[PDB]
Design a binder for these strands. Structure first.
Lengths: 125, 197, 106, 51, 151
RNA sequence: GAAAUUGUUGAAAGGGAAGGGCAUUUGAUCAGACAUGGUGUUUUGUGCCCUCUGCUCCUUGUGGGUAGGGGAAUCUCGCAU
RNA sequence: GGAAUACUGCCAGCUGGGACUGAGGACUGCGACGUAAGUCAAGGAUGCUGGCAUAAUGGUUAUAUGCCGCCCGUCUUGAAA
RNA sequence: AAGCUCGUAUCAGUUUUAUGAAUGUAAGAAUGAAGAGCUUUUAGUGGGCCAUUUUUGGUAAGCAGAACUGGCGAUGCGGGAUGAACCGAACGUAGAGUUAAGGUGCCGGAAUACACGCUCAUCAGAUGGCGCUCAAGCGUGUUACCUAUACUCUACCGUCAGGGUUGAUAUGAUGCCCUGACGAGUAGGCAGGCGUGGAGGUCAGUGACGAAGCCUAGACCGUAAGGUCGGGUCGAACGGCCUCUAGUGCAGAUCUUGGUGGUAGUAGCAAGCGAAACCACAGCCAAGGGAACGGGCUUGGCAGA
RNA sequence: UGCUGGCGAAUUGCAAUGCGUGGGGAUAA
């Protein structure tokens, strides 16, 4: 699909303050609640915080580098909902699907022209 | 514009020279200051002799042996005046100073090689006529440096060995000046002149 | 025979900076024999290359190149602002940078 | 809506009959094989016992 | 063309960008000695012949002098020197954009080279040292400041 | 069979502090199509194609499923070469 | 007596060099140019050309370099404490 | 917060004229604002200090008290070497351009610019250091340049405001759009989401061809809460969706429980055996960092395992 | 290349710079 040049604004992950120093403090983002915190008062040098400005362009949101929107698929029935949106959406074969069923899904998605984001998953030659 | 740029302190001003030599390093420009001893400062002698000793009384308390090491040798006296403008800590510096080489006098293998001067740091081009102005030499002497003599003598020798040279050379370019002077006028010549040469 | 040089050689000085903040995107380039902004106006828009040896051989050559452009002048000395694709490494503060003669106004 | 959209359904489903194109010029010497994690150790821990 | 759009894609707006012929800078006049700056023949002295339809320049060495064939080149990757030659004797109009298609060197290309180059060699011999000038290669020596240099 | 923590091995760094943010180089390293056509003509060969004969489910014409023969010298209608 | 020329200001004067951006998505509208037919720089970039699959490219980690970054939380007091 | 009249001539930290003893009342005065008033109820709030301008009390001085308007408080950013009180500038995410305050010898991005004069100091001077003397000082003028989150333009995010849209729109009218403006924030208020255990419903969901979990110098998405996928390990159940329900989300509590370090092969036993107190993190000096605060900063001296 | 010659250049397609280890032996410490 002819897509716009996808701008990301912030590629780096918004890690927590002192997530790296201490081990018990997780890298998952939590706001600094204390009034005397430098991160909360956004001092120069300190880590950047997640705010609404970093939000992605509506036209190019949810899009993978291929220019397709991601879409989970369990079986051949859920796969065949994207018979009309091959250029827009991409089949993401779910993690828990067996190797026995994937060979079936990949056969159909290849025929319908649906780009699968994760082929070669559990499947040798 | 020249891998190395041997400079000649003789008739300069610690600070200005320095400075300009500084910049030249931080911008990848190898350098080599010579005749260090015959450098120059500003203001009477008794001056620089103070505005130094003070720098001498320095020293650390508990352990004087771990404080401001007061180098006498000019080369150094000046090398400091320089390492003073060069972060001389962050690698970017170390990288510099690492590009320097201040000698007292003019030892090989430079002796035999051209030098220059930083026209923006000459006693004779910055100091208002007749006005007190040190000469490192004495200054160093007065505060330690035990060689002003050696270089001194061991100097004059260098000037000889050369002076003698020049002659041979000067006596050489005396010919050329003629060779062309004669071979001049002809044709092939005329032409050039026209275009400029 | 000796000279194959189709570039004016100039040193990479620093990044565009204040006292306490530096923008690594815009590099400052001294060019040889350039004294004024008026002389530097000629070099605006010309392609720059920083050429350097690397350890590993990439494409039958141990030598890699970063390409960029002169954007504008910087002060009265003929120091020039310059934006590359990938920014210059900051280890190169005082390293030779090849400024070419394309694209030509003349 | 239904005028051009059934026209559009028909278009895509006719170019789904590119299946025959894939299945006439098949003759492919590959075919997907599962790697069951029991076999992954019957053919690891028995080679290490072989050596 | 007969095959209907199987997916709904938006048609382009009627774009308001009519193409206009390239207006070359004043220094370029057909029959001008140039300096190529980039590519295989960088730093060569090469004669300019014709402005083409694809916004390029058709140029020849000539080949007999410096080993530069009938090549196309871009206008921006050239310095035009003020030294002009006679060009009116040369029949250039045979070749255009389509001439340089590729779908070991073809004999037709070699014959077009020699016919043109002989009709050019004759006028190069008039002025002194011009043959030797084209054989030489351009370079910037120590002290050459291109913002000062008059080409 | 998690983390703290411990050993070994490998890589990297270390001139009286480390960890962090912006940017980049080098070193190591991982990604990176069982993607292969599309269109327009031309041999043929088949079929749900032409043609002859039918049979059967139901709702309104603008229906659906399904046999027996023939035939390409008309027909791209489709699919195979 | 005879013209200038700086200086201030204007031009809906001309001709270049460089950087950044290309948003929007059938057509409607305000216009210009052309006798008309139309065309155009007029309600937001088009055209040509090259680099590819052992690709092109993009990322992760490790450190280096330039610049920046007081130890988090609670509780006082005018804030630092 | 909601309801009611209105959307106005409802007003304003302003100017003006008019009329009295800086200061009262009006305007058929200006300028700006479509954001007003009337209910009804509901959280949080009872800190000062500094500076400005009027005085009042005052002797070696300082100041003491009263009133007035700001600054910090709840507030980052550029500059002043460094800083509660100075100077500039009130902040969505970026790209380009232009500047403020402050600067252009070098550290330090930017003129060792131009021009007129003055200044020699035995620790000049402007000093953060080095250093400076027809200056890199003093007085002044002329331009050029440097750069902040400031202004300008463009994109993007969201919020608010105004509006279009059906004999139905080549997408859920609680959609799809069009235009403009705005964006700091503690206590508090309102709103939209993400996650966990179980319940109803649904996906004729996933699953020994490997569910759940666990890692991973692996990849993608979401501003984020988090979600998804590859690889490795595993062995039996589990997840999305529309709803319900609660013992539902942790960094702290000299927290509780369990485990494991540094201390340490140290004290010790009246070559072996073997703790505990304690533990944010490190531990060089000088000078400045306003506040009986220097240990992280600034500028120097320096520093080899 | 001081002067005069005789040949080759393409297709690279219109730019993308184009001296240590891990072991032996012999001998100095």
């Amino acid at each position: 699909l002819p897509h716009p040049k996808i701008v990301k604004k912030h590629t780096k992950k918004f890690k927590r303050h002192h997530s790296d120093r201490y081990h018990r403090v997780a890298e998952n983002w939590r706001k600094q609640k204390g009034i005397d915190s430098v991160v909360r008062r956004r001092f120069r040098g300190n880590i950047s915080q997640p705010k609404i400005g970093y939000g992605s362009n509506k036209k190019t949101k949810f899009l993978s580098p291929s220019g397709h929107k991601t879409f989970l698929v369990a079986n051949v029935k859920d796969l065949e909902t994207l018979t009309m949106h091959t250029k827009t959406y991409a089949a993401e074969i779910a993690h828990n699907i067996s190797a026995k069923n994937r060979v079936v899904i990949l056969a159909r998605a290849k025929a319908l022209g649906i780009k699968v984001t994760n082929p070669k998953g559990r499947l040798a030659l | 514009v020249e891998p190395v740029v041997v400079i000649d302190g003789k008739g300069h001003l610690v600070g200005r020279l320095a400075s300009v030599v500084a910049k030249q390093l931080l911008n990848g420009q190898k350098i080599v200051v010579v005749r260090a001893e015959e450098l120059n400062i500003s203001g009477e002698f008794f001056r620089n002799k103070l505005k130094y000793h003070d720098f001498l009384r320095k020293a650390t308390a508990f352990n004087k042996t771990r404080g401001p090491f007061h180098f006498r040798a000019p080369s150094r006296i000046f090398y400091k005046a320089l390492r003073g403008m060069v972060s001389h800590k962050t690698a970017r510096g170390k990288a510099a100073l690492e590009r320097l080489k201040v000698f007292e006098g003019i030892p090989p293998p430079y002796d035999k090689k051209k030098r220059v001067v930083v026209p923006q740091a000459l006693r004779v081009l910055r100091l208002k006529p007749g006005r007190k102005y040190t000469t490192l030499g004495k200054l160093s002497t007065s505060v330690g440096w035990k060689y002003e003599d050696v270089v001194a003598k061991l100097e004059a020798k260098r000037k000889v060995s050369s002076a003698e040279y020049y002659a041979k050379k000067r006596a050489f370019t005396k010919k050329v000046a003629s060779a062309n002077a004669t071979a001049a006028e002809s044709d092939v010549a005329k032409q050039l002149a026209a275009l400029g040469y | 025979a000796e000279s194959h040089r189709l570039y004016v050689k100039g040193k990479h000085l620093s990044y565009q900076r204040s006292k306490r903040v530096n923008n690594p995107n815009v590099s400052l380039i001294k060019i040889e024999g350039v004294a004024t902004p008026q002389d530097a106006q000629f070099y605006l828009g010309k392609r720059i290359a920083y050429v350097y040896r690397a350890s590993k051989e990439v494409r039958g050559s141990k030598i890699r190149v970063m390409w960029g452009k002169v954007t504008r002048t910087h002060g009265n000395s003929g120091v020039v602002r310059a934006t590359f694709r990938n920014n210059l490494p900051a280890k190169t503060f005082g390293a030779s940078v090849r400024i070419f003669l394309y694209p030509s106004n003349i | 809506f239904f005028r051009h959209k059934c026209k559009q359904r028909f278009t895509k489903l006719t170019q789904v009959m590119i299946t025959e194109r894939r299945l006439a010029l098949r003759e492919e010497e590959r075919h997907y094989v599962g790697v069951a994690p029991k076999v992954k150790r019957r053919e690891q821990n028995r080679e290490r016992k072989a050596l | 063309p007969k095959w209907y759009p199987s997916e709904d894609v938006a048609a382009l707006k009627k774009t308001r960008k009519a193409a206009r012929p390239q207006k070359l800078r004043a220094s370029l006049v057909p029959g001008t000695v140039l300096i190529l700056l980039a590519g295989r023949f960088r730093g060569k002295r090469v004669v300019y012949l014709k402005h083409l339809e694809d916004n390029t320049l058709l140029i020849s060495g000539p080949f007999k002098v410096n080993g530069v064939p009938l090549r196309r080149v871009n206008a921006r990757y050239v310095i035009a020197t003020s030294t002009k030659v006679s060009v009116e004797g040369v029949n250039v109009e045979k070749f255009n954009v389509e001439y340089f298609a590729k779908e070991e060197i073809k004999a037709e290309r070699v014959e077009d080279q020699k016919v043109v180059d002989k009709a050019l060699i004759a006028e190069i011999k008039k002025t002194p040292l011009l043959k030797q000038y084209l054989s030489a290669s351009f370079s910037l020596k120590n002290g050459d400041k291109p913002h000062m240099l008059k080409f």
